[PDB]
Coordinates of C-alpha atoms and ligand atoms in Angstrom, one line a residue:
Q1 CA -4.4 23.2 10.2
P2 CA -5.4 20.9 13.2
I3 CA -2.6 18.7 15.3
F4 CA -3.7 15.8 13.1
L5 CA -2.5 17.2 9.5
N6 CA 0.3 18.7 11.2
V7 CA 1.4 15.4 11.9
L8 CA 1.0 13.3 9.2
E9 CA 3.2 15.5 7.2
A10 CA 6.0 15.6 9.6
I11 CA 6.3 11.8 9.8
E12 CA 5.7 11.3 5.8
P13 CA 8.8 8.8 4.7
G14 CA 10.9 10.4 2.6
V15 CA 12.6 9.4 -0.5
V16 CA 13.7 5.4 -0.9
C17 CA 15.9 3.8 -4.1
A18 CA 15.6 0.4 -4.5
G19 CA 19.3 -0.4 -5.4
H20 CA 18.3 -1.4 -8.8
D21 CA 21.2 -1.8 -11.8
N22 CA 19.9 0.4 -14.7
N23 CA 22.7 -0.8 -16.8
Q24 CA 22.0 -4.7 -16.4
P25 CA 19.2 -5.8 -18.6
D26 CA 15.3 -5.8 -18.1
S27 CA 14.8 -9.3 -17.0
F28 CA 11.9 -10.9 -14.8
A29 CA 14.8 -11.9 -12.5
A30 CA 16.5 -8.5 -12.3
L31 CA 13.5 -6.3 -12.2
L32 CA 11.1 -8.6 -9.5
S33 CA 14.6 -9.0 -6.9
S34 CA 14.9 -4.7 -7.0
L35 CA 11.2 -4.7 -6.0
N36 CA 11.8 -7.4 -3.5
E37 CA 14.4 -5.7 -2.4
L38 CA 12.7 -1.9 -2.2
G39 CA 9.9 -4.0 -0.7
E40 CA 12.1 -4.3 2.9
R41 CA 13.9 -0.7 2.4
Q42 CA 10.1 0.4 2.4
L43 CA 9.0 -2.2 5.2
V44 CA 11.2 -0.6 7.5
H45 CA 10.1 3.1 6.9
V46 CA 6.4 1.4 7.1
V47 CA 7.1 0.4 10.3
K48 CA 8.7 3.5 11.5
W49 CA 5.7 6.0 9.8
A50 CA 2.8 3.8 11.3
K51 CA 4.2 3.2 14.9
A52 CA 4.3 8.1 15.1
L53 CA 1.0 8.0 14.3
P54 CA -1.7 9.4 16.5
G55 CA -3.7 6.9 18.1
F56 CA -1.3 4.3 17.3
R57 CA 0.4 2.9 20.6
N58 CA -3.5 2.6 21.7
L59 CA -3.5 -0.5 20.4
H60 CA -1.8 -3.6 21.7
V61 CA 1.4 -4.7 20.7
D62 CA 0.2 -7.6 18.6
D63 CA -2.6 -5.5 17.6
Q64 CA 0.7 -3.0 16.2
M65 CA 2.7 -5.6 14.1
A66 CA -0.4 -7.4 13.1
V67 CA -2.0 -4.3 11.6
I68 CA 1.2 -3.1 9.7
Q69 CA 1.9 -6.9 8.5
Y70 CA -1.2 -7.5 6.9
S71 CA -1.6 -4.1 5.6
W72 CA 1.8 -2.9 3.7
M73 CA 1.0 -4.3 0.4
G74 CA -1.7 -1.5 0.0
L75 CA 0.0 1.8 2.1
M76 CA 3.0 0.6 -0.4
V77 CA 0.7 0.2 -3.6
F78 CA -1.2 3.6 -2.3
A79 CA 2.6 5.7 -1.9
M80 CA 4.2 4.3 -5.2
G81 CA 0.2 5.4 -6.8
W82 CA 0.8 9.1 -5.5
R83 CA 4.3 9.4 -6.3
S84 CA 3.4 8.1 -10.1
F85 CA 1.2 10.5 -10.2
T86 CA 3.4 13.5 -8.7
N87 CA 6.6 12.7 -10.2
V88 CA 5.4 11.5 -14.0
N89 CA 1.7 11.9 -14.0
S90 CA 1.0 8.4 -13.8
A91 CA 3.1 7.3 -17.6
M92 CA 4.9 5.3 -15.9
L93 CA 5.1 3.4 -12.3
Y94 CA 7.3 5.0 -10.0
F95 CA 8.3 2.6 -7.7
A96 CA 11.5 4.8 -6.5
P97 CA 14.0 6.9 -8.2
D98 CA 16.4 4.8 -9.5
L99 CA 13.2 1.9 -10.2
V100 CA 10.8 3.4 -12.8
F101 CA 8.2 1.1 -14.9
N102 CA 7.9 2.1 -18.2
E103 CA 5.1 -0.6 -20.8
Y104 CA 8.4 -2.8 -21.2
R105 CA 9.1 -3.1 -18.1
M106 CA 5.0 -3.8 -17.0
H107 CA 5.5 -6.8 -19.1
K108 CA 9.2 -7.7 -18.4
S109 CA 8.0 -8.5 -15.1
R110 CA 5.2 -10.6 -15.9
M111 CA 2.9 -8.6 -13.9
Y112 CA 1.2 -6.4 -16.9
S113 CA -2.2 -6.9 -16.2
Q114 CA -1.3 -5.9 -11.9
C115 CA 0.5 -2.5 -13.7
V116 CA -1.7 -1.3 -15.6
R117 CA -3.9 -1.9 -12.5
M118 CA -1.9 0.3 -10.2
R119 CA -0.8 2.8 -13.4
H120 CA -5.3 3.0 -12.9
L121 CA -5.0 3.9 -9.2
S122 CA -2.1 6.3 -10.0
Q123 CA -5.0 8.6 -12.4
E124 CA -7.5 8.1 -10.0
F125 CA -5.3 10.9 -8.4
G126 CA -5.8 13.0 -11.0
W127 CA -9.2 12.2 -12.1
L128 CA -10.2 13.2 -8.6
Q129 CA -7.6 15.6 -7.8
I130 CA -7.0 14.3 -4.8
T131 CA -5.2 17.3 -2.8
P132 CA -1.6 16.1 -0.6
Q133 CA -4.1 16.1 2.3
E134 CA -6.9 14.0 1.3
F135 CA -3.8 11.5 0.4
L136 CA -2.4 11.7 3.5
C137 CA -5.6 11.3 5.3
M138 CA -6.5 8.0 3.1
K139 CA -2.7 5.8 3.7
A140 CA -3.2 6.7 7.5
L141 CA -6.8 5.1 6.8
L142 CA -5.0 1.8 4.9
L143 CA -3.4 0.5 7.3
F144 CA -6.5 0.4 9.7
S145 CA -8.5 -1.2 6.7
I146 CA -7.7 -5.2 7.2
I147 CA -8.2 -7.3 9.8
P148 CA -8.7 -11.4 10.6
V149 CA -11.9 -12.1 10.4
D150 CA -11.8 -13.0 14.4
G151 CA -10.9 -9.0 15.4
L152 CA -7.9 -8.6 17.4
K153 CA -6.5 -9.0 20.5
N154 CA -8.1 -5.9 21.5
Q155 CA -10.6 -4.9 18.9
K156 CA -12.2 -1.8 20.9
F157 CA -8.8 0.2 20.7
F158 CA -8.4 -0.5 16.9
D159 CA -12.2 0.3 16.2
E160 CA -11.4 3.5 17.7
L161 CA -8.3 4.5 15.8
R162 CA -10.4 3.9 12.5
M163 CA -13.2 5.5 13.6
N164 CA -11.4 8.6 14.1
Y165 CA -9.2 8.7 11.0
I166 CA -12.5 8.1 8.6
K167 CA -13.7 11.4 11.1
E168 CA -10.1 13.8 9.8
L169 CA -11.1 12.0 6.5
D170 CA -14.4 13.8 6.7
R171 CA -13.2 16.4 8.2
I172 CA -10.4 17.5 5.6
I173 CA -13.1 16.6 2.8
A174 CA -14.8 19.1 5.0
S175 CA -22.3 17.0 -3.0
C176 CA -19.4 16.9 -0.7
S177 CA -20.1 13.9 -0.2
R178 CA -20.2 12.7 -3.6
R179 CA -16.1 13.2 -2.5
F180 CA -16.4 11.5 0.6
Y181 CA -18.5 8.5 -1.7
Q182 CA -15.9 8.7 -4.4
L183 CA -12.1 8.6 -1.5
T184 CA -14.0 5.8 0.2
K185 CA -14.8 4.2 -3.2
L186 CA -11.3 4.6 -3.9
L187 CA -9.9 3.3 -0.9
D188 CA -11.9 0.0 -1.6
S189 CA -9.9 -0.4 -5.0
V190 CA -6.7 -0.3 -3.3
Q191 CA -8.2 -3.5 -1.8
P192 CA -8.4 -5.9 -4.6
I193 CA -5.0 -4.6 -6.7
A194 CA -3.7 -5.5 -3.4
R195 CA -5.1 -8.9 -3.5
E196 CA -4.1 -9.7 -6.7
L197 CA 0.3 -8.4 -5.4
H198 CA -0.1 -10.6 -2.7
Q199 CA -1.4 -13.8 -4.4
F200 CA 1.8 -13.4 -7.4
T201 CA 4.5 -12.1 -4.4
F202 CA 3.2 -15.3 -3.2
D203 CA 3.6 -18.1 -5.7
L204 CA 6.9 -16.0 -6.9
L205 CA 8.5 -17.2 -3.1
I206 CA 7.5 -20.3 -3.5
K207 CA 8.9 -20.7 -7.4
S208 CA 11.6 -18.2 -6.0
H209 CA 14.1 -20.6 -6.5
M210 CA 13.6 -21.8 -9.9
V211 CA 13.5 -18.3 -11.2
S212 CA 16.6 -17.3 -9.6
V213 CA 14.4 -14.0 -8.3
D214 CA 15.8 -12.8 -4.9
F215 CA 13.7 -12.6 -1.5
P216 CA 14.8 -10.3 1.5
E217 CA 15.1 -11.7 5.0
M218 CA 11.9 -10.1 6.4
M219 CA 9.8 -10.1 2.4
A220 CA 10.0 -13.8 2.9
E221 CA 9.2 -14.1 6.3
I222 CA 5.8 -12.0 5.7
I223 CA 4.8 -13.4 2.7
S224 CA 5.6 -17.0 4.3
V225 CA 3.4 -16.4 7.6
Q226 CA 1.2 -13.4 7.3
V227 CA 0.3 -13.0 3.1
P228 CA -1.1 -16.5 3.4
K229 CA -3.6 -16.0 6.7
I230 CA -5.1 -12.8 3.9
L231 CA -5.1 -15.7 1.1
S232 CA -7.1 -18.3 3.4
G233 CA -9.3 -15.5 4.3
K234 CA -8.4 -15.5 7.8
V235 CA -7.0 -12.2 7.7
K236 CA -10.2 -9.5 5.2
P237 CA -9.7 -6.4 4.3
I238 CA -12.7 -3.5 5.7
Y239 CA -14.3 -2.0 2.8
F240 CA -16.5 0.2 2.5
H241 CA -19.1 -0.3 0.3
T242 CA -20.4 -3.8 -0.4
Ligands
DHT1 C1 5.5 -3.4 -2.7 C2 6.3 -2.7 -3.7 C3 7.5 -2.4 -3.5 C4 7.0 -0.9 -3.1 C5 6.5 -0.4 -3.7 O1 6.8 1.0 -4.0 C6 5.1 -0.8 -4.1 C7 5.4 -1.8 -4.5 C8 4.1 -2.9 -5.5 C9 4.7 -4.4 -5.7 C10 5.1 -4.9 -5.3 C11 6.3 -4.8 -4.8 C12 7.6 -5.7 -3.6 C13 7.7 -6.5 -4.4 C14 6.3 -7.0 -4.5 C15 6.0 -8.2 -3.9 C16 7.2 -9.1 -5.6 O2 7.7 -9.9 -5.0 C17 5.3 -9.3 -6.5 C18 4.5 -7.4 -6.3 C19 5.6 -6.5 -5.7
MXD2 N1 -12.3 9.2 -12.1 C1 -13.0 8.2 -12.2 C2 -14.2 7.8 -11.4 C3 -14.5 6.7 -11.6 N2 -15.3 6.4 -10.5 C4 -14.6 6.5 -9.6 C5 -15.5 6.2 -8.3 C6 -17.2 5.7 -9.1 C7 -17.1 4.5 -9.7 C8 -16.4 4.7 -10.6 N3 -14.8 6.4 -13.0 C9 -14.2 6.6 -14.4 N4 -14.6 6.2 -15.4 N5 -13.4 7.2 -14.2 O1 -12.3 8.0 -14.7

């Protein structure tokens, strides 16, 4: 319909596999190493997605990387939750076609609770009958949903961008307002999830030698330089609802 929807559809990243060896048995080290690797792979695509987003180049260059660097966990969880929805109706987590988590992997990854949280999120796409277009605008909005408490290098450009992505979400919803409450509530629910994964990946990186869980270059860096900013409270999500 609009140029906006056109673009989100056009730029939506395709299939990313994890490289996981599905012949080897399930083990914390194998699974988490494959996850970390899927993380690196998807990071590459999120950067490119983000950069091709309407209005994105309005942001100051510093803010362009910051915003991505802070929001990846949520975008990735969110996108994954939708894959898990469309591909398997939320019965398992469809991280990638070569890394689908059944309950046994949920428990073997040592992230069962976090996993059940994501499965639930995935179910929400069903329970609310989220349209493919609702999904894409929502995921777009997620990128503008976490920021330093100090604001950004150029706070005004960000606010404008964030304002218009809200407007678009609203235009594509357009009592019809329970809809908006719900979706905004759905969006807020990504954040407590991402915070758990944040603490978890961080702890994991710290003891990563002691468990033989393997971290790739870009993952290690972001998790040690950027993720701690979030957990120390220097960077916080923007919630719709208090
Ligand atoms: C973002 C990823 C990787 C890609 C994805 O589809 C969503 C998923 C959610 C769990 C993350 C994982 C990357 C590796 C992490 C960060 C692990 O170290 C702990 C939790 C994992
Ligand atoms: N789909 C939902 C949504 C939902 N709410 C989402 C938004 C408002 C607060 C909780 N609660 C329940 N039980 N289900 O099944």
